[PDB]
Design a protein around this ligand. Structure first.
Ligand SMILES: Nc1ncnc2c1ncn2[C@@H]1O[C@H](COP(=O)(O)OP(=O)(O)O)[C@@H](O)[C@H]1O
Ligand SMILES: [Mg+2]
Lengths: 375, 57
């Protein structure tokens, strides 16, 4: 299927795995990060004895399979799910073995050392891979953006990373990760819908309402004013049609769901909102480059697909920062895949072909030394 | 009774032919409606996507 000896770019982002060959502009195999294990034991004869579903095979059946998240906040919980999702991506979709081409994986900023050593060991010992490389997502996203300056805000599913890069320079001391993202928003919407009257307590419905949020939920331009005008609703409340057919009616809750990002007090945490944390990060940077960080801020992550985030960011930053300079916020189209796109354009360089880590040096050095070599 | 039985068998066979033809007719109508309803659902989902694209401005 592939006639070019190039690394397979597999972005294992929290919530959605995006795998594809280098050189492509979009991932071909896109599936959620979920593992469905058989809950009961059947006396039936003939069905697949497979004890571990994955991807679309699990999405197609969520009532029988108890759903487990292979990644939580960033820390890898179960490694069997890791081996399952890579083995599946290798021998069920791509139809190619890892013994013929490299593999450029993308990991989140500020992750545990155990996670890195574990994935590297599974990719070297178990699977025979000629070479591995771990890369931070923020750099590849800035590559795909086509710039060298700005602060990347990557909001995945269970973690949110703010990474400032000015003049193509990383700042490992300022990268601050906060576990507020799509899962805590799904939980907030679920508890407020339970407050509305429709109560559910199973994961399949949780994924359904997550999809409903992805499709409908947006960000408000003025929270309190929308609350007042929605008190007497007319066009502000919408009636959604569940894929099963049950008629759901959702009004203001939509534009109050992502608001939890701006007010973490809703989930009883002393952490500051994403905008205030980004602002504090900007103060932690130097003054000289702060204006450039204001003018080149970039966004990444699937959570940014909601309509109305750019305007909300502009008003909040204008209210926090002075209103004398110019603070333009740029969001490139299809930003979610941009990271992966970067991977593709990063795997075609010959120099990058010279910066890989082969098996033998890793085996003698050991995983810890490999951690030192990368950084 | 032989004459009556022959008549009865002829009419029963006619009714069997009728039920068979109606079964094919309903199966075809059901398939056509399934296709149209899928078209409508796709139209609705694409319209929702469009609506979020305009709200994104
Ligand atoms: N099309 C979409 N619309 C709205 N939200 C989305 C969409 N796709 C993904 N998300 C949200 O983004 C999160 C997953 O993001 P992720 O795939 O990790 O981004 P990235 O791959 O850029 O790191 C989930 O919480 C999900 O709710
Ligand atoms: Mg992300």
């Amino acid at each position: 299927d592939e006639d070019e000896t190039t690394a397979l770019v597999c972005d294992n982002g929290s919530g959605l795995v995006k795998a594809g060959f280098a050189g492509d502009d979009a991932p071909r195999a896109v599936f959620p990060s979920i593992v469905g294990r058989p809950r009961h034991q059947g006396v039936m004869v003939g069905m697949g004895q497979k004890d571990s579903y994955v991807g679309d095979e699990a999405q197609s059946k969520r009532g029988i399979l108890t759903l487990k998240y292979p990644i939580e906040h960033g820390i890898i919980t179960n490694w069997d799910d890791m081996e399952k999702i890579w083995h599946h991506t290798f021998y069920n979709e791509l139809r190619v073995a890892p013994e013929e081409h490299p593999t450029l994986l993308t990991e989140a900023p500020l992750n545990p050392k155990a996670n890195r050593e574990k994935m590297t060991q599974i990719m070297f010992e178990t699977f025979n891979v000629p070479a591995m490389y771990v890369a931070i997502q923020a750099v590849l996203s800035l590559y795909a953006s086509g710039r060298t300056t700005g602060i990347v805000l990557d909001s995945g599913d269970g973690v949110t990373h703010n990474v400032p890069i000015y003049e193509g320079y990383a700042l490992p001391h300022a990268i601050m990760r906060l576990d507020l993202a799509g899962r805590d928003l799904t939980d907030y919407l679920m508890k407020i819908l339970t407050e509305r009257g429709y109560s559910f307590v199973t994961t399949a419905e949780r994924e359904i309402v997550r999809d409903i949020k992805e499709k409908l939920c947006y960000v408000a331009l003025d929270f309190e004013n929308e609350m007042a005008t929605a008190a007497s609703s007319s066009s502000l409340e919408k009636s959604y049609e569940l894929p099963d057919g049950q008629v759901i009616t959702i009004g203001n809750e939509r534009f109050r769901c992502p608001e939890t990002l701006f007010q973490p007090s809703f989930i009883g945490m002393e952490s500051a909102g994403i905008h205030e944390t980004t602002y504090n990060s900007i103060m932690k940077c130097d003054i000289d480059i702060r204006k450039d960080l204001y003018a080149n801020n970039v966004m990444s992550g699937g959570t940014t697909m909601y309509p109305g985030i750019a305007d909300r960011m502009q008003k909040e930053i204008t209210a926090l920062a002075p209103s004398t300079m110019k603070i333009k916020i740029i969001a490139p189209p299809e930003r979610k895949y941009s990271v992966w796109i970067g991977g593709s354009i990063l795997a075609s360089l010959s120099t990058f072909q010279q910066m890989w880590i082969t098996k033998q040096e890793y085996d003698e050095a050991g995983p810890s030394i490999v951690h030192r070599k990368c950084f | 009774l032989s004459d009556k039985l022959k008549e009865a068998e002829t009419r029963a066979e006619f009714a069997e032919r009728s039920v068979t033809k109606l079964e094919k007719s309903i199966d075809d109508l059901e398939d056509e409606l399934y296709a149209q309803k899928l078209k409508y659902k796709a139209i609705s989902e694409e319209l929702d996507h469009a609506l979020n694209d305009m709200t994104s401005i």
